[PDB]
């Protein structure tokens, strides 16, 4: 059922849960998850976008979760 990897689950969880009106911008995302390299986050973003979990809002790099934990 969890056809996602624990890191991507985590990233998604941060994006969905983080109590900011401005979703979780890529820069905020990386500042939180310092270990999660920019490329790896870009890959995660692509994946989670393709899964229809996250989407970009006010800017390309400004993500929110549609309704995915």
């Amino acid at each position: 059922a969890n056809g996602l990897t624990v890191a991507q689950n985590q990233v998604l969880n941060l994006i969905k849960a983080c109590p900011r009106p401005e979703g979780l911008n890529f820069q905020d995302l990386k500042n939180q998850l310092k270990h999660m390299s920019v490329s790896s986050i870009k890959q995660a973003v692509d994946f989670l976008s393709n899964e229809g979990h996250i989407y970009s809002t006010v800017d390309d790099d400004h993500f929110k979760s549609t309704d995915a934990e």
Partner: peptide, 16 residues
Amino acid sequence: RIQRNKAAALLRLAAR
């Protein structure tokens, strides 16, 4: 670039 982004996400999610 940005348009029906949420709807696209819902569609992607649903179409699985």
